[PDB]
Amino acid sequence: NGIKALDPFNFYRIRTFCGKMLDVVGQSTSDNAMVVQYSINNKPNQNFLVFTLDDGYSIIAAENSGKVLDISEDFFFKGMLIQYHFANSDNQKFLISNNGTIAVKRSGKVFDIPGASTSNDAPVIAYNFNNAANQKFTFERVKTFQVPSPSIGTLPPAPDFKNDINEQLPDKTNPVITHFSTIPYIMANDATFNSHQQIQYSPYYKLVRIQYWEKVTQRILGPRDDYEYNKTKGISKTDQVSMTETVSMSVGADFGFMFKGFSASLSAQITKELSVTKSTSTTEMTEETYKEKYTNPFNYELARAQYMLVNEFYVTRMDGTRITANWTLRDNTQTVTRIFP
Amino acid sequence: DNGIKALDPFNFYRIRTFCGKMLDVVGQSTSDNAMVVQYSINNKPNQNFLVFTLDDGYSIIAAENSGKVLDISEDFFFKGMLIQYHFANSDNQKFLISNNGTIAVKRSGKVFDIPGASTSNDAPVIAYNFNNAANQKFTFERVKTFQVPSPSIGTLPPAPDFKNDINEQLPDKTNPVITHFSTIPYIMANDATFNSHQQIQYSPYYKLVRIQYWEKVTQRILGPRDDYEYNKTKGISKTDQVSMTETVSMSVGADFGFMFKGFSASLSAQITKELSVTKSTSTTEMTEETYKEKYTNPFNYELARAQYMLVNEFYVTRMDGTRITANWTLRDNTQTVTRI
Amino acid sequence: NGIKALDPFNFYRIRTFCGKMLDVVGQSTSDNAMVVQYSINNKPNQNFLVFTLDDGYSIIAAENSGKVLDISEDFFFKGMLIQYHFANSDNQKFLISNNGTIAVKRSGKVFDIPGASTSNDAPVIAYNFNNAANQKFTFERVKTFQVPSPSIGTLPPAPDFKNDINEQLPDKTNPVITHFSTIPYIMANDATFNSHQQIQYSPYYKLVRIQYWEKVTQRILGPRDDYEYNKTKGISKTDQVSMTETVSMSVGADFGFMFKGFSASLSAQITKELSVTKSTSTTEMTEETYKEKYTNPFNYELARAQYMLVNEFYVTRMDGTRITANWTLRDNTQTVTRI
Amino acid sequence: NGIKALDPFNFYRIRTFCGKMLDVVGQSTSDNAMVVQYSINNKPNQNFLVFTLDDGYSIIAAENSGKVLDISEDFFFKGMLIQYHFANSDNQKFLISNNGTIAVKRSGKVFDIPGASTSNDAPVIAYNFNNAANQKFTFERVKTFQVPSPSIGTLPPAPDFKNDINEQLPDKTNPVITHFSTIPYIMANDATFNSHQQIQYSPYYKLVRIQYWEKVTQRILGPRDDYEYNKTKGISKTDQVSMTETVSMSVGADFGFMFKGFSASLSAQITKELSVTKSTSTTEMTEETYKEKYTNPFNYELARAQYMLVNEFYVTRMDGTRITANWTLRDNTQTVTRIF
Ligand SMILES: [N+]
Ligand SMILES: [N+]
Ligand SMILES: [N+]
Ligand SMILES: [N+]
């Protein structure tokens, strides 16, 4: 037996050995954080989302709030299952297996119904694995939702001269959405939605990548004339801060992404989905504008235009509402030079 | 509904739930936390309890397995759960045991409840609104019985008197006699050499004992018109005041009444009754002071004058009689006898 | 909260609050009539047909036999859900609503899984509606079948003389199927199929109406000649008995249909589908043959032909197999006379 | 394993595998005869009496109605467990075993919770034994009652003359209660108590035997003097019919009891408790009165007195209330003759 695979866009019902379902409210526990197995209610308190991370451990989020399942390390109530806001803690990371066991990352203990209770307010306490039926759970599909996909297009080539030395080439190519990454609400910080609102309306947020060619300079100069032009590379501090505040990410000096806090758990997925490299750099990149000088090497009058690859990254809600401005990263490494024949 | 259920103080009781299981402060899956759950009969101290009934009619339920008592959590995350916690004079630890079978929390009025009427071995207890369901009813069973030794009691003798010998030296103090004692639960008394667990094991009840005797302030023989000044002392020492408060959270007020602090207040009525002492109405605490008094003989014939002052000594012992504190001495200035 | 609509030609699976299905056999109930909540087995004992009547209430029939869901009125087992043959009784009539509730017609009580049992042999007991999850059920399409439709033709006009040749006109026009009605097997009494066989092979029966003109008389006579000819109206007793025996219907004296017993439940539907009138007559119609006399009013040789509208009604199985002879009704009211 | 033994005078609670109890009313089944699994109520709906018969099979009676557990033979509800008025039917007779299984006498299948339902209002259906947990049940003592026992005395000897030929001996000895038999209410036909009333107030009825000597004749005779006197033996028709109507018993011609209907199931107990013989006679006894003649063979003047053993049988409720007249049986076989 191995890791259980669950579709991400389904709300799930967690069925216990006796046919009752985990409920984050309960009857006698209505006024506290306890999670108990209760009779089927067909209510959001019994609906969950399972977010599987790179390490194979998953985050289980209740629909009733934005909060997730948590195993208390409290001295007085050690081992209890409660509902607590996401804090990227090992007691909140669970391993769902085909055998039916939900295993805590922090401790090898698994979900267990104390005394194999069949009662409606029976709590869940972490217990050493013993292969008893009361330790086994089944996930049922409750309802399904869809995440719209943005239209995707490939990057066009940098514009080129067409037999006219005095033609002005476009300042930039039409921006195209080349990639996007689908991440859970727990990762994205939305100023205008609280955690509960998020899971209700935007369970997954989308991080979208647009690529286009930006014209650094175009000038016509004499056979043996030189000129100096400004060129800009990198990403602004404001974009760096905003990226970190929203998704706990920044861009490293090596043009790789730096994953901080919660984001690190999905580093592999995000890099793969955006076609970007994980940073190996200690320091974060800054926007730099510097002067570069070009001299005409040919004796005939010559026209030169240079394009730089530019990336814009932004986060949207599931529906597509954009919650942040585009974060601009200029890659000086990827550049195309155009001249008149 | 029917009324307060009365339980003998010197019995350990087993609390039986609706399904025939017993409340257990350890549990199986809860062994590593403070949760109290109904479990199958094991006849072990984790299922044994001792009941302390206070003046207000509410009782404290103390486990035998530890010195801790039953408590209802007010934590945001685990509100209403029943756990074992060190005793504090808080209403969530005070419960009303009634003939109808309900254990009611003082703070909230809610009663002990087995969630979902679970018959399971680790079913927890949660305070829940009274609905007269079977799962809210509990029965107390006698498990074991113990006896508290009582100190021998004698009346205060009369102050010593002269027997036709003007040169006789009267006793400096009369033989001390134990006039009163008060039986209090271990939760009230702080024992330096026994921890709470040890206390419930070995001295569930402590004894607060009152000794009374006459102490001779002065004796003198003088001529028709002779003057002298002698020391006289009244009150209770600062050290005794601190020790009394430290040990049983009590002190003596300036009006010769006792001041009850913290836990002690819960049994004030019992203690005052058992010791035959008055509750203080004074804000300030009494202090021992020594002052000089001057006497002149009013008669032309030679006479001898001796004065005795009534002295109280209060001390705390363990159930077996082991003394854990020095006698706390209170000098009653108003109660004095003069002999000629 | 309104009435739920289900396609008639689908077999349905009744899904309970816990994802288990109603099963008319069960494990511990295999030897009795009880219907219980059971895990999916993909067998006909979990397959049902829903027959919606004129009153909006529906009949639920299990595929395993011809029998339908029934709520016991037994003193000892009152309120239990069992499988029992159709008897057109209110305890067998159920109201399916969008809220998910199946409501008994006789009482206000609805289907309920006692104690919200998740067990494989949990019974079903009628209980007062409380909006609990254990009272809500979902119908899922399992498999579907098609009911053939007969070729439909309009009534031709009665034939007329051509060129005054005084030729012999057709005795009857080519019969055409003007109408047909699709009804469930529970309404039809089939001698050669038992109830179990019916639901297996002919879930719905078809009642077909054919109309054509019948020549009552044709004769050529001289000026002012009179003659008496026989004319026949109505429906035969044998057809009346066979119609009642097969579909519990008869034809009333007012040329309307009389719906008796089970048939009444679909009276409106049937009348609408056949374009026929519900009878207001106390007595049933009989076939009558009587003489009618004509005198030529015109001072010349004249040819007269009269046609009467004739209806033939018959019942077939879903595949089209005809189980009864045509029932003939001659409509005296609708007649055409030509010269 | 073997037959489980239960004390007869206890009300019992039948516990299912999940800790819930059999309830003869239920919630959704409140309006029908079904017996279902339900949570503990501490109510008579869940209280039963177990009547163990001679064959080892037992009858379980509900306190809430007086009706007994019955396994339906209905075509539509075959195998369902309901409460039904008592009849001497094998489906109502169950075998309680140490393993926890309740087996129907009529059909081998035992009590089973369908689908191992842990829910309330879960039915009980007879199912083939498979040793599953849902087939095992445990009996808990709920409450206990006592059946008063009448004072028992031995039969005194028939009276004898005391040196006076003119002395008149007593017509009968003071009657004494030699035996009684404790029988369940289902056996006894009580006009004034219905089944519900019976199980509430007289779960067991008592059949009591009184014995005494009755003087058939007394006379003093001279030499060779003879006379004819009436003698009566047997039991009256009215007593026979009343005995049959009340406890379905009668007395056979061989002075043994004939057990009819349910009574036969308890034959061994009753015969033992009353010290009476089970009848082997085809026909029932009738009361007969006939003349018997005695001749004095001796020339002494002699007084002759003859006593016949007389039995009185009657039925009382548990408290002792008598519901029927004494049934009089005169045994001519046991007779004593006295001479002077
Ligand atoms: N509520
Ligand atoms: N243990
Ligand atoms: N089945
Ligand atoms: N009940």
Residue numbers in the entry:
A (entry chain B): 17 to 357
B (entry chain C): 16 to 355
C (entry chain D): 17 to 355
D (entry chain A): 17 to 356
From the paper:
Cry78Aa is a novel protein identified from the Bt C9F1 strain that effectively kills rice planthoppers, with median lethal concentration (LC50) values against Laodelphax striatellus and Nilaparvata lugens of 6.89 and 15.78 μg ml−1, respectively. We also found that Cry78Aa binds carbohydrates such as galactose derivatives and is essential for insecticidal activity against Laodelphax striatellus. Bioassays showed that the NTD or CTD of Cry78Aa alone has no toxicity against planthopper nymphs, indicating that its insecticidal activity is dependent on the cooperation of both domains.
Here, we resolved the crystal structure of Cry78Aa13-359, which approximately resembles full-length Cry78Aa. Consequently, the structure of Cry78Aa13-359 was resolved by combining SAD with molecular replacement using Cry78Aa155-359 as a model. Cry78Aa13-359 exists as an X-shaped tetramer in the crystal structure and the four molecules are nearly identical to each other. Taking one protomer (Mol A) as an example, monomeric Cry78Aa13-359 exhibits a rigid rod-like shape and comprises two domains, the NTD and the CTD. The CTD of Cry78Aa13-359 is mainly composed of several long parallel β-sheets and three α-helices, and is regarded as a β-pore-forming domain. The NTD of Cry78Aa13-359 glues four protein molecules together.
